[PDB]
Design a protein around this ligand. Structure first.
Ligand SMILES: CC(=O)N[C@H]1[C@H](O[C@@H]2[C@@H](O)[C@H](O)O[C@H](CO)[C@@H]2O)O[C@H](CO)[C@@H](O[C@@H]2O[C@H](CO[C@]3(C(=O)O)C[C@H](O)[C@@H](NC(C)=O)[C@H]([C@H](O)[C@H](O)CO)O3)[C@H](O)[C@H](O)[C@H]2O)[C@@H]1O
Ligand SMILES: CC(=O)N[C@H]1[C@H](O[C@@H]2[C@@H](O)[C@H](O)O[C@H](CO)[C@@H]2O)O[C@H](CO)[C@@H](O[C@@H]2O[C@H](CO[C@]3(C(=O)O)C[C@H](O)[C@@H](NC(C)=O)[C@H]([C@H](O)[C@H](O)CO)O3)[C@H](O)[C@H](O)[C@H]2O)[C@@H]1O
Ligand SMILES: CC(=O)N[C@H]1[C@H](O[C@@H]2[C@@H](O)[C@H](O)O[C@H](CO)[C@@H]2O)O[C@H](CO)[C@@H](O[C@@H]2O[C@H](CO[C@]3(C(=O)O)C[C@H](O)[C@@H](NC(C)=O)[C@H]([C@H](O)[C@H](O)CO)O3)[C@H](O)[C@H](O)[C@H]2O)[C@@H]1O
Ligand SMILES: *[C@@H]1O[C@H](CO)[C@@H](O)[C@H](O)[C@H]1NC(C)=O
Ligand SMILES: *[C@@H]1O[C@H](CO)[C@@H](O)[C@H](O)[C@H]1NC(C)=O
Ligand SMILES: *[C@@H]1O[C@H](CO)[C@@H](O)[C@H](O)[C@H]1NC(C)=O
Ligand SMILES: *[C@@H]1O[C@H](CO)[C@@H](O)[C@H](O)[C@H]1NC(C)=O
Ligand SMILES: *[C@@H]1O[C@H](CO)[C@@H](O)[C@H](O)[C@H]1NC(C)=O
Ligand SMILES: *[C@@H]1O[C@H](CO)[C@@H](O)[C@H](O)[C@H]1NC(C)=O
Ligand SMILES: *[C@@H]1O[C@H](CO)[C@@H](O)[C@H](O)[C@H]1NC(C)=O
Ligand SMILES: *[C@@H]1O[C@H](CO)[C@@H](O)[C@H](O)[C@H]1NC(C)=O
Lengths: 488, 489, 489
């Protein structure tokens, strides 16, 4: 006496947003944005980071006496540094092309220290200088990877030193030039006035001269030390020549292995954990195409946006009924699929569920979500560059570029989710109506529409007849004759 | 008796573009692109800008004698500068890190001039030097904020000077080095050869040597003056030492205010008006989310898109054509109460009507759609504008390409959104009308007859109350079922 | 009798991808991505390129003796250069601001070499110096466009020279400074010790001092030679002055065309063709909006995308299976005259036809959609290739990041747009067919019988004329109202 069409309802209270209506309660949803992190600084793919502590890159490479534990550092995954490290250049001065050196370090995973110029080779100079700026146990000291050359007796012969790169791969060499305060300092230390420092390779030619002038006292001294670096290629030679004011290197840094790394500015300490994507705030264990944790991440991190909510609609609208049809609303007791029928024949009732339509819809929505998710191209992220106080325009350019790309991706994500939600919520209603129309057109003129969602039979359509009606194979003539009799 | 389903039509002539069709006429439309301006330069939030006139930034800061009106400048919101200022470096020369100085000036908004090295302190030199390039009333003169040190008698003692920044904020200081033409000028001015100019701070250490060489004559002189600048931090000392060829500063520029500003490149003047957004052509008084007036802007402004028409569709399609039939032909021109409605023609009389629920639902949907489109855009206090020297062409190309790419991306996004939501809205209205027709048909069942034009022909006698119930959902099939079979037979 | 409604099917095997399903076969498809080139380097707009061979830009401009084929070069469309040229600076040294010079050369289409300082005006210096690094047939030689100045007798007077730019356009001038190895070399070549080189223009002021030190041997020499360049404006003068170590110029390079070009890093030669776009792999001849050949192109051509397939679905879904059934069972292979149509079987035969109005409307809509996704692209003569030095790694990373980001954005846009448009068109065709069926049903009404498959059995007798009457849309309902009532019962 009754076969009806209706859809599925449940107790879900998930809300998605479309472009024509907000706060739409749905049965099934899927968040595609992650907002959680572990909160600890961990190991990236099992490799511990380089914990500099309160030391700077310059202090580590030059051998600041306070950074004595960073003398034989092993493999590392990324560098952990403080915003304002305390122990950098103990002797006041500058470091030429510091940011370029940091950028180079952003792609190096190991260093091996090679003794290129031994300290005892300077048989005609004094190699025991020091200062109270870099002092250990009260007594003066100096950088542990550099040599300060001073006159022996009352003479400063021309100092010449050379090295040929027979180590195996590229080498990093740092030297410095000392600028005294007054003329008496220069005469006491180097015995000559008008000195020069010459450094030359196959691709480098630099000659520097000292500057003597009264300067404001930094760390109790009016003198400065300017440091420079170069990258010595394989099978190349470097030459040193100076009549005074030379801080000769004693060790060279050889690149052992290369890879993808970065410098992360955190004030934390490493803890025992293993991670893949590491933000300055904590680790991430995710699979979604979006997150809103931190922009400057290191690793394989999906995507950063300023959207606080991105939920895709995977199911139908939750419209409880207050046997009716799909005009009134969904059904609570039809837990077998998505779309289905209901019947009340002589034998017994029961909430069935159509299989082909539900399967087709499930495949379509699954393909939709997979297409949205699996079109992101996530690569290694190591963004974050350092700029000097005389490169503000470049810093502004970088900031604007990142901001613009972020805004574009945010707009794309929000547009995609809204339009997709609207299309899916229309798709489900279209499928329900298609099923009802197919059933009605196959049944033809042996039934009576009731205007609420379903029919009333003009004949005794038994259980096999009923399954045939749902099967799609309903014989019209073989029950036609009786229907005409009752309808009239 | 009869009843029909139809929609609204009027005498609008607006046009929207869809992806499937061009030049579609609609009843209602919304414009979300601003293309007009007042053609004036006004004050931003009540604070007038700085009008340099024919003076450059270097001429203002160095104290050009022809820029004397700028010796004491109040607070500003932005700076107006001509493309090729005439009154600049009166004495020929250069200015190291000029573009960086301008970029710093882009976020300053106020300065205070503080006398750090008074001119009378140089008791062992001469401080009354002037050139005919920077001449006032015929006699020679010089920059008003700088001091030219020259030998006193027949001797040039070592010149020393210092300043401790006890003012409370960062200070900007400019010095200079003089490059003569020949050796006799060097001997006449400084009495010795092989000189130096040394400047040192806590983070700066610079030494310079003058260059003596014959040069092409600019402004009648072959000599040049090179200027440099620095930013002195709080509680920090600057030291000056020179054996000759030093143009010492007399004043320092303290940063009083700080904020978002910029440098406009215009040849116009200031006019008595107010605004919240600015372009080099004129101000913009708008609330729409997009504009296409000028890329260069100062303040919170609608996003720039290379577009000429961005119109959303709010109402329905326009088919003026209309016994009165239904929606098969077109809309009704007399149903001014809403968007969807009916038409009842019982024996008592006739009259159009509008259904409230569908109209309210469609109105809410359209309104929130336009809200979603408009409100998903972030506008900040962008301060577009940057200068590059003649040795940084690659940087200028990079900046131009970045800006052009981002603008193009945003234009494409906005255009595609508008073009797709228009078609979605039209399909929405068609579907809503069809849904109303189908609901009425299903509630009416076989009590009526369809004539194939959106209308129904009632079989019984439907009075005014009967039709009122029909357009209400309170229509009872059994109450008229018994007589209904008689008419069909 | 009977009249059935269905769509058209053929034997196509083209596939498109939607956002709800994959592996979807369609009747007609359009490819908008070009994946093939010509494989050869050819002329652009009839103008042959400039083939540097094994020479570099520095070697060509300076006058390297190996690059003697380029002492007179005609107008060019673009420059082809190798990744690691062999014949560059024969004398070891360096070239200041090389990348800026290449960037400037990326916008110049012709040069006119002009003799600005002849070699015979140096009447007090020797001008016949050479080296074994730049050797022609064993004997030492030197750069063809530069002059090496050496002491005459035992004296090196002050070298002085000047040129006034009266040519008619901007000029390029290159000069060099020589750094010896030991003091003996300096005394042998220039007599005096402690020399200088000064070059000055209206906007340039430089003073270089030679550096004497022992350096690793490159090309058998420990000495080096440093080169600098400048751009001299019209009606301007350049002054040279030196006491030693001056590599004076003899020719200037006047810019004479000033168009749009570039430098292509290729390792191939030139053939005899004529193209419009030129990628390093080969030439492109197409009229499509996309290609995936190479990121760097020269000329005008489609936009680059990192993808493998972009197919637009124009036709209908291809289901083969079809008394005759209708669109519900599937399409037909018989009526190849349109997309949607009717099928009738009356007493005087049977056949197929097509509804012209619906097919025309769908065709225009699809063409508008295709042209709207194609014509919204912004195409321009853009420059991509840029060069950076070993101390400019951050800038190179910035440029690479910007290019990769824009490429990813546009690729994603193209893919998602294609998917969405395919879904819309495949639903649009079904909506059109269903609308046709519903229109015929509403018009035809009670005189007929629906049958499920998608068609209608008449309750009266009909012939061809009635079939056209149904097909055109004018079907007289009352003319069979009495007749259809009799056959109903
Ligand atoms: C070695 C030493 O202590 N020299 C001090 C110098 O004494 C001279 C003696 O060597 C010479 O033969 O005879 C004269 C008298 O005719 C002295 O007795 O006297 C100077 C002042 O008169 C000291 O000045 C102070 O030096 C301080 C710096 O000392 C240190 C430092 O703590 O940084 C450490 C070393 O003593 C000193 N020398 C070396 C070779 O390392 C270095 C060096 O002077 C600079 O750091 C680098 O140029 O610095 C302060 O600079 C203080 O301001 C100053 O007055 C000599 O220390
Ligand atoms: C002060 C003055 O006018 N000096 C001129 C100089 O006079 C010599 C005087 O110093 C000496 O004691 O006695 C002899 C006679 O025994 C002279 O009277 O003579 C020069 C020519 O031989 C002039 O040179 C010309 O200077 C021009 C520029 O004039 C100014 C200027 O307006 O820029 C005048 C300024 O008074 C002068 N001094 C100062 C401190 O600013 C400057 C200065 O010399 C230049 O700026 C140096 O770069 O120049 C032209 O340059 C012209 O080409 C040149 O011949 C002396 O003006
Ligand atoms: C012109 C010449 O042959 N010079 C050689 C020099 O000559 C001496 C002469 O100056 C002196 O008065 O008398 C003695 C005999 O009593 C010599 O005849 O002697 C040098 C060695 O003692 C040679 O040195 C070698 O030069 C090599 C380079 O030759 C070239 C070159 O290929 O670069 C060519 C020319 O000799 C010269 N160019 C000129 C003069 O215009 C350049 C010149 O040295 C540049 O400064 C290159 O740096 O050198 C190698 O450099 C080799 O290492 C060196 O020992 C002189 O060739
Ligand atoms: C939707 O729900 C949120 C709570 O999650 C509420 O803040 C917001 O106001 C709601 N929207 C409307 C239009 O009421
Ligand atoms: C450096 O050592 C390598 C070892 O193979 C050698 O070939 C090269 O000539 C050396 N360099 C110099 C300048 O001797
Ligand atoms: C329903 O269709 C299935 C097709 O898999 C068939 O196996 C089954 O026998 C059918 N049942 C009836 C009652 O027709
Ligand atoms: C649409 O109208 C504009 C002017 O309003 C006209 O230029 C354009 O050709 C029209 N397009 C079509 C397809 O009619
Ligand atoms: C500069 O002034 C501050 C505050 O008055 C003071 O602490 C500092 O010592 C001064 N500098 C010097 C070098 O005395
Ligand atoms: C129309 O429907 C409303 C529903 O709230 C009801 O209150 C009203 O009585 C109805 N009017 C008639 C005439 O049935
Ligand atoms: C579609 O067909 C291609 C082969 O042309 C195949 O590689 C791809 O996997 C197919 N898509 C799906 C979803 O199977
Ligand atoms: C260079 O030539 C132009 C035109 O011939 C002339 O006006 C100018 O004065 C000349 N330059 C010099 C320095 O004389």
């Amino acid at each position: 006496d009754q076969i009806c069409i209706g859809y599925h309802a449940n107790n879900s209270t998930e809300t998605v947003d479309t472009i024509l209506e907000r706060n739409v309660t749905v049965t099934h949803a899927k968040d595609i944005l992650e907002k959680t992190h572990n909160g600890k600084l961990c190991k990236l793919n099992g490799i511990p980071p380089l914990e500099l502590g309160d030391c700077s890159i310059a202090g580590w490479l030059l051998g600041n006496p306070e950074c004595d534990r960073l003398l034989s550092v092993p493999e590392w995954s990324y560098i952990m540094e403080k915003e304002n490290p305390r122990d950098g250049l103990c002797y006041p001065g500058s470091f030429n092309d510091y940011e370029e050196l940091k950028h180079l370090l952003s792609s190096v995973k190991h260093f091996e220290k090679v003794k290129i110029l031994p300290k005892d080779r300077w048989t005609q100079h004094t190699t025991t200088g020091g200062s109270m700026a870099c002092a250990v146990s009260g007594n003066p000291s100096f950088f542990r990877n550099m040599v300060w050359l001073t006159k022996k007796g009352s003479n400063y012969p021309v100092a010449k030193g050379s090295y040929n790169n027979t180590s195996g791969e590229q080498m990093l060499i740092i030297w410095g030039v000392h600028h005294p305060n007054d003329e008496t300092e220069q005469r006491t230390l180097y015995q000559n006035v008008g000195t020069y420092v010459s450094v030359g390779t196959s691709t480098l030619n630099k000659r520097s001269t000292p500057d003597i002038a009264t300067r404001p006292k930094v760390n109790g001294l009016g003198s400065r030390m300017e440091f420079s670096w170069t990258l010595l290629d394989m099978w190349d030679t470097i030459n040193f020549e100076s009549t005074g004011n030379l801080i000769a290197p004693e060790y060279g840094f050889k690149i052992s292995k290369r890879g993808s790394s970065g410098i992360m500015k955190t004030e934390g300490t490493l803890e025992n954990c293993e991670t893949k994507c590491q933000t300055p705030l904590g680790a991430i264990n995710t699979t979604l195409p979006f997150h809103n944790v931190h922009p400057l991440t290191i690793g394989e991190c999906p995507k950063y946006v300023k959207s606080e909510k991105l939920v895709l609609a995977t199911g139908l609208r939750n419209v409880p009924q207050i046997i009716a049809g799909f005009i009134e609303g969904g059904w609570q007791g039809m837990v077998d699929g998505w779309y289905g029928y209901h019947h009340s024949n002589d034998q017994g009732s029961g909430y069935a569920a159509d299989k082909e339509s539900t399967q087709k819809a499930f495949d379509g929505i699954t393909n939709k979500v997979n297409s949205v998710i699996e079109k992101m191209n996530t690569q290694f992220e190591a963004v974050g560059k350092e700029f000097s106080n005389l490169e503000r325009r470049l810093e502004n350019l970088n900031k604007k570029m990142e901001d613009g790309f972020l805004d574009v991706w945010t707009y794309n994500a929000e547009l995609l989710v809204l339009m997709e939600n609207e299309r899916t919520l229309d798709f489900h209603d279209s499928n329900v109506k298609n099923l009802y129309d197919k059933v009605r057109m196959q049944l033809r003129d042996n039934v009576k529409e009731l205007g609420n969602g379903c029919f009333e039979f003009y004949h005794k359509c038994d259980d096999e007849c009923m399954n045939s009606v749902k099967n799609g194979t309903y014989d019209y003539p073989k029950y036609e004759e009786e229907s005409k009799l009752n309808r009239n």
